[PDB]
């Protein structure tokens, strides 16, 4: 994190009492190349350039050496031209910035065309930056010809204008508030066990100031009540230099007032600023300093010297800014019936004719009708059916979100005597609320690994972008006219009416419709269940009955919603109306409503409001992975949730940064490449001069991807030493020195990376070749007061699972600390940037248990080294505390693979698991080693201390259990990313077991115990 989670065990107050490659094919161009230059005089002069050559200097050389060829008077000075070539994204590119190195242009073949700036838009054409950042040239969009895409691009700027306006509104302060959000917890209240590190109620907080034209430091130590705004913290610093024997005190009291708001505090060592009236201890730095035995070190600094470096002013609307006859849907008489025509091909071997048919189904997550295959009749060759398929549903009863799912597929039964391919999904409704009709050709997707479920309605809706694929041609009914979903006006009418119909009560032979309710409505007991609980037919109906009573308990909504007969136009209209003015619910509850059980525009629209109002920028920054994950189930490009996210992300740069990486990391992923590509564009167009930093992180990550691509693969499977020879050489090269020095850490943009420590970066020893890089912190107040910077660039392991686990642990920890007491986890930094490409933060000063050996007791002796005598007691306080957290969490999340080279111990005494990857199911930990460190040395488990350890674990387990839901939902939202451990609710079931859930509280505490004082017991492998 800040200080590398290194506790100073001493602070009882009293101090004074695709793929990369530069050039197609070749991973690395030779030290020198022949680049052919095609001149406007018409002549190819072939020019010999070193690869690092800048374009300014290639131009020079080209023009010098061109006047040695014919037609040379037929020239134009030199700087009139600007190179153009073809990049390996198959596009022609004007190379306006002529600092760009030859090795850096993503050229295809070494040639450059010389032309003239026709287009004359040096400015707008430098939205080549927008394409770079996104990775995908901006204008694969300009040539799309789908009205939804072109619409989105236009309509989404409303948000960009609005957001860019909000930023400048309140001129200079809001700009800084945006570029530098306050990094702040969401409750100002301090948990009592922190209060008791400042048992006075207050904290010592050094406040440095830079004085020399070449920096000179003054201290002023200062002491103040934890809960004191920075405004006031600046004051007490004034009243300390200013204090004087000539200065009376209303003389000082005034002029404090008068200078209090002309300064600004800043965390020393990184780019974090205290720009808001927040309780000093509410800032993560501060609370984190209390927590590690640390003296806050702030930097006083004049507001006006910060505001001078904030140049984002410009936002430009881009070049792409510039009624028939309808029947209201339910006028339509008689059932839906879709015509299946013919697939063009299919990859079956034909010497195996379990023949071929199209399975189909109308759906709303789970289907709203009996679903039906067409006759097997066709024996491939020319897969054709020509048949209409009859689905039993009135067209009037089609829900808004209703869509059709189909596949081509095969199964079995054929052994003995008893009784797949490619799937595709389609929105029965336009984004314009039209119900589709006519010719539809659908390119289908490949079946994803594992899922042999025959119909896959969780896969996206859309035709396959790749048209070299089996393609199923379709026909929907066409009525007299264009058929639209009815206006919201109309629906609310029908709702009203068919409840005024309801007061025709007459017992009847049914149970769903029935409406008082006695004391035995106590089925507020169901409101309390977790969202995977499973709701019985009896219960589903009980709910639709006492629906109008439900308003008095808002949080039933998810369950009531899963009880609506989503194929009843009556019931849905009535539901629509309840959702209309439903008391809003806690953000952690609304989120659920954005998974794929709740697809209905009205419902999801509601969640987005509950978020707009209640969810704080903190909590956003936290559950962001899910929110970005969950756009994938929005039916259309332009929806409420994007307009939300995107607005937030242009409004708070710290969100922005990750909003962007989380989207960029899946750009390789074709099912989602354009929705994300589209999203990413609007964001860069509107993000101000941050794009320039992002571009630098991208520039750098590519160099990194490429370098590792040679370290495995492109031979370089030489002696470890040889490989290192290459790395060292290659880093020294000037293209690389530029690319990889002085840019913001993707793990934390507040973390400036300066120049490399070349003699500290090395290739780790894994099959995949993980580059361990060290940068200087170029902050003035860096090395004392803070740190030097280590990250792992790892190219091969898919880091998403680790990412999510580390998210969940943070949250877990977050819960245990706010409940009071107090198990310290180490949610180290992890960020997925690409197709299995990622960055991991080095937690400096940790070693694997399986290093510490090179003793069964001497793990406890290693701990009594590093921690001397008195300090030593808190190392057991720490080790014991962290072991619990990971015992409890490791158990709940179900992590096997728990061997001593996966668990690390840090010098201060802290424990923390690393390298997760493998999820839930796909016993417990407790080796003697650990069990020896708890119970300071002894061998006798029945110890005074081990008893306490049990209370922590009991208290903790149950804390998570109370907070089941958040966790069930956090996992729930994940089901649409390529992650191969979370594809079904089936998969999530694991943690529903591990937290007992189905049993009582008292029962679950008993079961966990039935898990705790168990486990018991060469060490690299295991034997006898």
């Amino acid at each position: 994190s800040y200080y590398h989670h290194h506790h100073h065990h001493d602070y009882d107050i009293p101090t004074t009492e695709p793929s990369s490659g530069e050039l197609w094919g070749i991973h690395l161009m030779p030290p020198r190349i022949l680049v052919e230059c095609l001149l406007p005089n018409g002549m190819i002069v072939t020019l010999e350039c070193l690869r690092e050559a800048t374009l300014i200097t290639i131009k020079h050389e080209l023009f010098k050496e061109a006047r040695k060829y014919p037609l040379h008077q037929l020239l134009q000075d030199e700087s009139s031209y600007i190179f153009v070539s073809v990049t390996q994204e198959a596009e022609r590119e004007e190379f306006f910035d002529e600092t760009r190195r030859l090795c850096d242009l993503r050229l295809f073949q070494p040639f450059l065309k010389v032309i003239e700036p026709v287009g004359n838009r040096e400015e707008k054409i430098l939205n080549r930056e927008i394409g770079f950042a996104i990775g995908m040239p901006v204008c694969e969009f300009d040539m799309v010809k789908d009205p939804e895409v072109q619409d989105f691009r236009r309509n989404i700027l409303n948000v960009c204008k609005e957001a860019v306006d909000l930023r400048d509104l309140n001129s200079p302060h809001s700009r800084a508030m945006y570029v530098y959000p306050p990094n702040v917890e969401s409750s100002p209240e301090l948990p009592k066990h922190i209060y008791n590190k400042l048992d006075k109620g207050q904290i010592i907080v050094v406040i440095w100031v830079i004085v020399s034209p070449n920096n000179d430091k003054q201290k002023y130590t200062l002491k103040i009540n934890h809960d004191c705004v920075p405004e006031q913290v600046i004051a007490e610093a004034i009243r300390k230099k200013t204090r004087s024997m000539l200065l009376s005190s209303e003389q000082l009291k005034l002029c404090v007032l008068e200078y209090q708001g002309k300064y600004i505090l800043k965390v020393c060592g990184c780019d974090e600023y205290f720009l808001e009236k927040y309780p000093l201890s509410q800032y993560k730095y501060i609370r984190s300093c209390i927590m590690l035995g640390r003296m806050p070190n702030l930097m006083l600094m004049a507001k006006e010297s910060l505001y001078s470096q904030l140049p984002m002013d410009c936002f430009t609307m881009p070049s792409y800014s510039r009624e028939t006859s309808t029947k209201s849907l339910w006028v339509i008489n008689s059932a839906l019936r879709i015509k299946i025509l013919c697939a063009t091909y299919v990859n079956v071997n034909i010497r195996d004719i379990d023949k071929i048919y199209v399975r189909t189904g109308i759906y709303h997550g789970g289907e709203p009708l009996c679903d039906n295959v067409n006759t097997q009749r066709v024996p491939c060759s020319n897969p054709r059916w020509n048949e209409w398929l009859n689905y039993d549903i009135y067209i009037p009863d089609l829900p808004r979100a209703a869509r059709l799912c189909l596949s081509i597929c095969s199964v079995k039964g054929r052994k003995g005597a008893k009784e797949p391919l490619a799937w595709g999904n389609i929105n029965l409704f336009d984004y314009t609320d039209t119900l589709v009709s006519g010719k539809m050709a659908l390119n289908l997707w490949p079946v994803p690994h594992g899922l042999e479920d025959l119909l896959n309605p969780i896969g996206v809706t859309g035709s396959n972008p790749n048209k070299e694929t089996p393609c199923l041609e379709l026909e929907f009914d066409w009525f007299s006219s264009v058929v639209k979903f009815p206006d919201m006006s109309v629906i609310e009418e029908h709702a009203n009416w068919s409840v005024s119909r309801e007061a025709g009560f007459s017992y009847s032979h049914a149970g769903l419709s029935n409406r008082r309710e006695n004391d035995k409505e106590q089925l507020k007991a169901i409101s309390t269940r977790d969202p995977l609980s499973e709701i019985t037919e009896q219960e589903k109906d009980f709910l639709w009955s006492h629906r109008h009573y439900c308003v008095t308990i808002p949080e039933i909504l998810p369950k009531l919603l899963l009880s609506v007969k989503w194929n009843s136009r009556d019931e849905v209209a009535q539901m629509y109306c309840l959702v209309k003015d439903w008391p809003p619910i806690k953000p952690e509850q609304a989120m659920e409503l954005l998974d794929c059980n709740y697809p209905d525009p009205m419902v999801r629209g509601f969640a987005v409001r509950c978020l707009e109002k209640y969810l704080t920028d903190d909590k956003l920054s936290q559950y962001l992975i899910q929110l970005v994950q969950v756009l994938k189930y929005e039916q259309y490009l332009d929806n409420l949730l994007v307009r939300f996210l995107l607005k937030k992300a242009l409004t708070n740069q710290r969100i922005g940064h990750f909003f962007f990486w989380h989207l960029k990391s899946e750009m390789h992923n074709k099912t989602v490449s354009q929705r994300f590509g589209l999203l990413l564009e609007s964001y860069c167009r509107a993000c101000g001069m941050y794009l320039k930093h992002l571009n630098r992180q991208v520039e750098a990550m590519e160099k990194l991807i490429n370098l590792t691509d040679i370290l495995k693969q492109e031979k370089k499977d030489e002696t470890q030493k040889v490989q290192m020879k290459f790395l060292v050489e290659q880093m020294r090269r000037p293209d690389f020195m530029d690319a990889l020095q002085g840019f913001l850490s993707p793990l934390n943009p507040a973390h400036q990376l300066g120049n490399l420590r070349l003699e500290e970066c090395r290739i780790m020893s894994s099959a995949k070749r993980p580059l361990w890089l060290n940068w200087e912190n170029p902050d003035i107040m860096s090395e004392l007061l803070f740190q030097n910077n280590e990250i792992i660039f790892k190219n091969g392991d898919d880091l998403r699972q680790d990412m999510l686990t580390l998210q969940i642990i943070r949250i877990m920890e977050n819960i245990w600390q706010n409940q009071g007491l107090d198990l310290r986890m180490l949610p180290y930094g992890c960020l997925s940037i690409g197709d299995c490409v990622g960055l991991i933060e080095v937690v400096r000063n940790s070693h694997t248990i399986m290093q510490i050996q090179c003793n069964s007791h001497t793990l406890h002796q290693w701990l009594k080294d590093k921690n001397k005598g008195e300090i030593y007691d808190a190392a057991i306080d720490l080790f014991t505390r962290s072991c619990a957290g990971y015992c409890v969490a490791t158990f709940i999340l179900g992590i096997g693979d728990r061997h001593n080279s996966n668990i690390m111990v840090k010098d201060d005494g802290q424990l923390f698991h690393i390298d997760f990857g493998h999820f839930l199911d796909h016993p417990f930990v407790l080796t003697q080693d650990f069990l020896i460190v708890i119970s300071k040395g002894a061998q006798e488990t029945k110890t005074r201390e081990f008893e306490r350890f049990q209370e922590m674990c009991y208290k903790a387990y149950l804390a998570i259990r109370q907070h089941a839901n958040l966790f069930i939902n956090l996992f729930s939202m994940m089901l649409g990313s390529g992650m191969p451990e979370l594809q079904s609710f089936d998969d999530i079931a694991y943690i529903r077991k591990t937290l007992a859930l189905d049993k009582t509280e008292q029962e679950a505490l008993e079961y966990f115990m039935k898990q705790m004082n168990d486990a018991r017991h060469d060490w690299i492998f295991h034997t006898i």
């Binding site: 060829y69 073809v86 198959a90 079995k412 149970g511 037919e537």
Partner: protein, 234 residues
């Protein structure tokens, strides 16, 4: 027949019945052991409408049923009536039951090694797809390169056709012949680029074809995989 029939599975939980009922006719059923227990509760899972419906069988004092007036008491007697009566939205009866049917070392080791190759074929499959798409996008870059050099010819006939005559008379020709050399390489150079693309084209068409084969075998392993998996647990 009492606490131990065809459809009584008990020992299983929500996830297992979910997959056993997969794609079956309106009426496929079994009974289960419910979550919270008063010394015992039971759950019937009926097939209707394309979905699994959970129905709670109650106890209370010592008679069974679905709702308020609990009559049929012996667990089995309740299923023996069957669902028409209790609500009309469940009109279908209980058609399909479910029921049950390292010694078997040998008839599983095929599931090990045929699945060996399906986790090896999905690989060949994934890699080829990316790899093909690369070749597709490289071809795109080729034509585009080709279109530049071609346009360089245009930029040369014009510009040198009105000088293949001016230099012809200037008293000093001879320069015009060291110009043709450049045209000779230009047209020589384009031909190479055209071949380079061609060779890639007839590498894609044969890379593409290869992919169809990797698929063909996969769709033919797939169904044989499901049968062993099912000759195993049952």
């Amino acid at each position: 027949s009492l606490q131990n029939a065809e459809w009584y599975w008990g020992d299983i939980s929500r996830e297992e019945v979910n997959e056993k009922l997969r794609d079956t006719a309106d009426g496929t059923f079994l009974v289960r052991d419910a979550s919270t227990k008063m010394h015992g509760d039971y759950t019937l899972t009926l097939r209707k409408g394309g979905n699994n419906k959970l129905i709670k069988i109650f106890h209370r004092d010592g008679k069974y049923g679905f709702s308020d007036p609990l009559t049929f008491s012996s667990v089995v007697e309740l299923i023996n009536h069957y669902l028409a009566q209790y609500n009309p939205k469940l009109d279908v009866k209980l058609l399909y039951p479910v029921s049950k049917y390292k010694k078997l070392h040998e008839y599983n080791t095929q599931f090990q090694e045929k699945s060996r190759e399906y986790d090896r074929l999905y690989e060949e499959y994934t890699r080829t797809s990316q790899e093909i798409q690369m070749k597709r996008t490289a071809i795109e870059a080729f034509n585009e390169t080709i279109k530049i050099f071609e346009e360089q010819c245009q930029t040369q006939e014009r510009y040198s056709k009105e000088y293949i005559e001016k230099f012809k008379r200037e008293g000093n020709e001879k320069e015009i012949q060291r110009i043709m050399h450049n045209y000779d390489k230009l047209k020589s150079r384009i031909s190479e680029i055209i071949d380079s693309r061609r060779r890639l084209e007839e590498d894609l068409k044969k890379q593409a074809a290869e992919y169809r084969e990797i698929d063909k075998r996969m769709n033919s392993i797939k169904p044989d995989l499901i049968q062993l998996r099912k000759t195993r647990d049952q």
